[PDB]
Amino acid sequence: STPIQQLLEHFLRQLQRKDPHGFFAFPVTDAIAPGYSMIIKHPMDFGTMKDKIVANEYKSVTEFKADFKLMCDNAMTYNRPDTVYYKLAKKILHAGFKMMSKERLLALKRSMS
Amino acid sequence: STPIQQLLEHFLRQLQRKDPHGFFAFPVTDAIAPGYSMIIKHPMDFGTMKDKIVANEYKSVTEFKADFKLMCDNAMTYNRPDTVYYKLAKKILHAGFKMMSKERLLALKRSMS
Numbered sequence: 001s002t003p004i005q006q007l008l009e010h011f012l013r014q015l016q017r018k019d020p021h022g023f024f025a026f027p028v029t030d031a032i033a034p035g036y037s038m039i040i041k042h043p044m045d046f047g048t049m050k051d052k053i054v055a056n057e058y059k060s061v062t063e064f065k066a067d068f069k070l071m072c073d074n075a076m077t078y079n080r081p082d083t084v085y086y087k088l089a090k091k092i093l094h095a096g097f098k099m100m101s102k103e104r105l106l107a108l109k110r111s112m113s
Numbered sequence: 114s115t116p117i118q119q120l121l122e123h124f125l126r127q128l129q130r131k132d133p134h135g136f137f138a139f140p141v142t143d144a145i146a147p148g149y150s151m152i153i154k155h156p157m158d159f160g161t162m163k164d165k166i167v168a169n170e171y172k173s174v175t176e177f178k179a180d181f182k183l184m185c186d187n188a189m190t191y192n193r194p195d196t197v198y199y200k201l202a203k204k205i206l207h208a209g210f211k212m213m214s215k216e217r218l219l220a221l222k223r224s225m226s
């Protein structure tokens with residue numbers, strides 16, 4: 001492993017701690033969510049993101065954040081706002097934006113300087 | 114845990130992997146290393162470094178790197194060059210210097226955007 005990979009694993013672990021049921025742990029299938037494939041063409045989940053970190057496919061935090069936002073956006077797109085899935089996705093979306101904001105990334109940069 | 118703590122735990126883990134017998138895992142006593150405290154006025158070891166990470170006593174990678182360097186220097190000052198201790202400290206020093214170089218850290222900071 002590498003430093004960028006460890007920081008992204010950290011951010012991932014912190015986000016996944018907010019999903020203790022594991023709603024977003026693994027890909028949604030049509031078996032569990034009828035019509036999911038019809039509505040969601042760009043699927044994402046925390047397991048996939050973990051595999052992508054391990055293969056070093058994220059070249060920046062911006063790239064990692066985009067997949068994270070995509071996962072949350074898919075949950076809010078397929079599910080209606082009165083479901084546990086939508087509500088949690090909105091919450092964790094906010095937490096991730098705060099955790100990985102410019103201001104936060106700047107303080108971390110200081111500690112590498 | 115914080116992002117800096119996680120980064121430092123990564124560097125520490127990678128360096129300890131190079132010391133499977135734990136030569137540097139805990140403080141050297143004078144019973145095991147006669148006269149050590151006469152030669153070495155600022156002891157350091159991987160166990161202490163871990164405790165400092167946990168206690169949040171590193172302001173930067175520079176500070177951590179300085180403890181690692183101190184650990185290696187102590188080994189290379191006290192022990193004779195034909196010893197396992199000297200030779201392993203030198204090997205580990207070089208590996209650490211490669212892993213925590215300014216160049217590596219600039220690259221890592223670029224990826225935090």
Ligand SMILES: Cc1cc(=O)n(C)c2cc(N3C(=O)CC[C@H](NS(=O)(=O)CC(C)C)[C@H]3c3ccc(Cl)cc3)ccc12
Pocket residue numbers: 021022023024025026027028029031032033074075078079085
């Ligand atoms: C209908 C539906 C939509 C949706 O967007 N998500 C994220 C769901 C997640 C569901 N899951 C749960 O409600 C409980 C956790 C479960 N994840 S898990 O099986 O990997 C077990 C966890 C402890 C690791 C998740 C889920 C996700 C995919 C599938 Cl195929 C089944 C259930 C079920 C339905 C949906």
Ligand SMILES: Cc1cc(=O)n(C)c2cc(N3C(=O)CC[C@H](NS(=O)(=O)CC(C)C)[C@H]3c3ccc(Cl)cc3)ccc12
Pocket residue numbers: 134135136137138139140141142145146188191192198
């Ligand atoms: C003589 C000597 C000098 C020195 O600089 N070092 C680092 C030493 C390390 C020594 N140790 C070993 O040779 C084997 C490992 C041992 N570390 S450990 O007790 O923590 C075993 C581990 C698997 C948990 C190490 C050592 C370090 C501290 C002490 Cl007090 C005794 C032995 C022994 C002698 C010296």
